[PDB]
Design a protein around this ligand. Structure first.
Ligand SMILES: NC(=O)C1=CN([C@@H]2O[C@H](COP(=O)(O)OP(=O)(O)OC[C@H]3O[C@@H](n4cnc5c(N)ncnc54)[C@H](OP(=O)(O)O)[C@@H]3O)[C@@H](O)[C@H]2O)C=CC1
Length: 162
């Protein structure tokens, strides 16, 4: 399983349950990556989905109550069950597009970590938590140069190391 997330250089992920900055460029990449794979997105996150719904994709909506019905994605209230499901299908890749609470709960045990850095900065009421360098290491790093300083960003991939 792999976790994909993006955060501002200053230390911001979003605000009012929405993305203050618009980067369709990076978003297209994320959408393409999740193609042919099962991904789980938190309900609060779903509210931020700027390009919804997401047809022709195995998306699952995460909610507190199993009884609650969600459209476009399967509703599961058991965090442990999702993990076991992925374990059952090792061949299938798992990608998580939030929410932050979900990220935190599964932050301690993640096989693949995806980190996106933004050259620009945005103001918001949500700040990203501290990252343990010892817990994870970067397998490789990629540099992307855009005309606008804010547009330019660096993409890196981290994996668990013994
Ligand atoms: N740095 C980053 O890349 C990330 C950024 N973000 C940003 O944050 C926003 C979402 O974060 P935030 O608003 O704090 O809320 P979350 O998206 O983290 O909220 C998660 C929701 O999932 C459901 N849920 C949580 N825990 C469980 C559980 N144990 N069992 C079942 N369902 C569960 C709940 O739904 P309910 O209570 O509504 O039924 C809960 O409100 C996104 O819209 C985005 O803007 C989100 C993820 C990652």
């Amino acid at each position: 399983t792999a976790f994909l997330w993006a955060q501002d250089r200053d230390g911001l992920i979003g605000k009012d349950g929405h993305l203050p900055w618009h980067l369709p460029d990076d978003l297209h990449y994320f959408r393409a990556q999740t193609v042919g794979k099962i991904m789980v997105v938190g309900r609060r996150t779903y509210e931020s989905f700027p390009k919804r719904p997401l047809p022709e994709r195995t998306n699952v909506v995460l909610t507190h109550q199993e009884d609650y019905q969600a459209q476009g994605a399967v509703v599961v209230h058991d965090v442990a069950a999702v993990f076991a499901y992925a374990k059952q299908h090792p061949d299938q890749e798992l990608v998580i597009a939030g929410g932050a609470q979900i990220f935190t709960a599964f932050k301690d045990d993640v096989d693949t970590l995806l980190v996106t850095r933004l050259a620009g900065s945005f103001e918001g009421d949500t700040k990203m938590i501290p990252l343990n360098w010892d817990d994870f290491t970067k397998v490789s790093s990629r540099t992307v140069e855009d005309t606008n300083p804010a547009l330019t960003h660096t993409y890196e991939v981290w994996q668990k190391k013994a």
